């Protein structure tokens, strides 16, 4: 009934605009986004929207965009986000663009308190964010207040300590100075290597109840399912890795986890609505497929990207060593000039 279907897609660092047709599929829109930004490791990603009832939802790529209850507005608003997380960033985020998108999203969740982080880890993470953004600490340029314009720490860390912004800056600067010589893209990777070991990293939590009506959390992540106490989302009460699951299923509100081990009982929980159980199961199927895929041989495409990454890295290392050595040749000629 509108004459246009204008669409905005916001990534962690760009705003894109499209204009689609009534029969445009999720996959078609998704493919236009990733082509625009130059992303190839697309498997981790999704397009998230707000439905007409205000719930964050993933666009289904196998359905028409207009058939999915996207909040009606001009333009339609999507967030391009990592939906699935690797088991190890160093092994599995091959390309620098992939690493940057993950870094920006994870850092958002740390800073907004979504992903719990202890204070000392938050300062260490902030130091790598700073090395990436500023490069090497340089006492001629980075004076007191060089970080004053930056959101660097989780709100919980700021609120629960007594330090002022200057004291926080000095703690982060100590670490910043330790990173001198570290390439910006390497500091991004070091950030992610720390963040991926946080207890809440890469976990989707769903509110559930047991048969007695006690509130619990279900987590879904790369490695399987977990049951948590209502009041602790850090440490699972019961873990259900893939290797221990025989079947997961649902029937309206009831979700059943059937174990491989014949001695162990079924785990049953209840969601508020069928739609939630469908969301859980879809996320479990996506995760388990990626789990299996990373244990099978690399596709030809993945091999290509890995060989391109090795060659580009090898080349940049060589050019960097050449420039350092030329700088020494210059500094030598500047000082044997004076004689």
């Amino acid at each position: 009934m509108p004459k246009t279907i204008s669409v905005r897609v916001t990534t962690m660092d760009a705003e894109l605009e499209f204009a689609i047709q009534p029969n445009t599929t999720g996959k078609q829109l998704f493919d236009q986004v990733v082509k625009t930004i130059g992303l190839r490791e697309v498997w981790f990603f999704g397009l998230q929207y707000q439905d007409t009832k205000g719930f964050s939802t993933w666009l289904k790529l196998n359905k028409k965009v207009t058939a999915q209850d996207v909040r009606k507005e001009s333009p339609l608003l999507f967030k391009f986000r990592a939906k699935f997380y690797p088991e190890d960033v160093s092994e599995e985020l091959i390309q620098d663009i992939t690493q940057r998108l993950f870094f920006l999203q994870v850092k958002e969740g740390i800073l907004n308190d979504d992903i719990y982080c202890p204070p000392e880890t938050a300062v260490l993470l902030a130091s790598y964010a700073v090395q990436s953004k500023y490069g090497d600490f340089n006492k001629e340029v980075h004076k007191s207040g060089y970080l004053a314009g930056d959101k660097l720490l989780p709100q919980r860390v700021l609120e629960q300590h007594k330090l002022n912004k200057d004291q926080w800056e000095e703690r982060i600067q100590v670490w910043h100075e330790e990173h001198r010589g570290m390439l910006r893209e390497d500091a991004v990777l070091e950030y992610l290597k720390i963040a991926q070991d946080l207890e809440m990293y890469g976990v989707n939590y769903f509110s559930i109840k047991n048969k007695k009506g006690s509130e619990l959390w279900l987590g879904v992540d790369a490695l399987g399912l977990n049951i948590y106490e209502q009041n602790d989302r850090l440490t699972p009460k019961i873990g259900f890795p893939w290797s221990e699951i025989r079947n997961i299923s649902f029937n309206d509100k009831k979700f059943v986890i059937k174990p491989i081990d014949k001695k162990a009982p079924d785990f049953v929980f209840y969601a508020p609505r069928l739609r939630i159980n469908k969301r859980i199961l879809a996320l479990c199927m996506g995760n388990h497929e990626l789990y299996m895929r990373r244990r099978k041989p690399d596709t030809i495409e993945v091999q290509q990207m890995k060989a391109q990454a090795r060659e580009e890295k090898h080349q940049k290392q060589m050019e960097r060593a050449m420039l350092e050595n030329e700088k020494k040749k210059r500094e030598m000629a500047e000082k044997e000039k004076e004689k």
């Binding site: 790529l61 196998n62 497929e289």
Partner: peptide, 14 residues
Amino acid sequence: GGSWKYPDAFELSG
């Protein structure tokens, strides 16, 4: 042109 059969940007195997 809705031939992509899967919910995400990778195939689900049987």
